[PDB]
Structure 1
Amino acid sequence: NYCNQMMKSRNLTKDRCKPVNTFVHESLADVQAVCSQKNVACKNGQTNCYQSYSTMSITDCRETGSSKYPNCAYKTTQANKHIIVACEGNPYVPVHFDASV
C-alpha cells in the first residue's frame, strides 16, 4: 500500500495514526509557484490562500474504519485536481495544504 508505506517513511505514522494526508506528485518548484496564482480565501476565512490554475497529480491517503495505533491502515485514492495552499514567508512558499478541488 503506497499510503501505508509513505505515511511511515515520511514520519507521519511512526508515533500515531494521522486520519488523512495528501501527497502531491509534481516538482517542488511547480507547487511553490501556486503561491503566485489565484488568490482565494482559506477555510478559516484568512485570504493568504491560492488555487492552482491547472489540476495536479495527487493521491489522498484516508484511514480506514479498522485502523488503530500500531497498525494504521489507509485507503489510497489517486486523482487530478486543483490544489489550494496557504502561503507565508519570504520566499513566499506553501506552509499548509488547505484543499484540493
Structure 2
Amino acid sequence: DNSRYTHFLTQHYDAKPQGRDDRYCESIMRRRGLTSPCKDINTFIHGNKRSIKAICENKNGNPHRENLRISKSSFQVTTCKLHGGSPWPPCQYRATAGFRNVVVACENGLPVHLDQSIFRR
C-alpha cells in the first residue's frame, strides 16, 4: 500500500510550479484538495522527485528528532499560509518561497509525511 506516499506527493510535491506567488498558492491548494476545510499552512517541495525519495536512504538523509528524517540536500519549497480567517472556501493564501532542507517521515522507503513545523516561521 503506497497510498500514503501518493498522498504525500499530492499534498507536498509540485515539480515545476512557475510563479510561486500568492495566486499560485490559492490555485494549488484548491487543485490538491486542501481547501475543504482550508488548511492553515502547507508546504510544497519542488524539483526532481527522486531527490525527495532519497531522503529515506543514507543517500540524502539523517535521523531527526524521535522518528523523522532530515534531508542532506536543500530543496526549493513554497509555503502557503492561510490569510485570516475562515476555515471554508474561498481560502486566501500568502506564499513564501524558500530553499532549504526538509524534514519527512519515511515508511517502506518512501516519504509519507512532511513536518510543517520548520515552515511555520
Task: Establish whether TM, by shorter chain, passes 0.5.
Answer: yes
For the residues of structure 2 that align with 1:5 and 1:67, how far apart are their CA atoms?
Answer: 17
TM-score (norm 1): 0.83
1:2 to 24, 44, 66: 24
In 2: Cα distance, 1:68 partner to 1:17 partner? 5
Amino acid at match of 1:4: E
**Residue number among 85, 96, 100 corresponding to 1:77 in the alignment:** 96
Calculate the aligned-residue CA RMSD, in Å.
1.6
Distance (Å, rounded) in 1 between the aligned partners of 2:62 and 2:87: 38
Please say if residues 67 and 73 of structure 1, whose CA atoms lie closer than 8 Å, have aligned partners that are also in contact.
no
Unaligned runs of 5+ in 1: none
Alignment of 1:1-101 (within 5 A): 1-13=23-35, 15-36=36-57, 37-41=61-65, 46-47=66-67, 49-89=68-108, 92-99=109-116, 100=118
The separation in 2 between residues aligned to 1:26 and 1:53, in whole angstroms, is: 15
Residue segments in structure 2 that go unaligned for 5+ positions in a row: 1-22
How many residue pairs get aligned? The number is: 93
Structure 2 CA distance for partners of 1:67 and 1:75, relative to 1, 3 Å: farther
Q: String of CA shifts for 1:20-70, please: whole Å, max 9, x gaps.
A: 1000002111100011121112xxxx32x2111121100000001244422
Identity of aligned residues (%): 34
TM-score (norm 2): 0.70
C-alpha distance in structure 1 between counterparts of 2:48 and 2:83, whole Å: 29
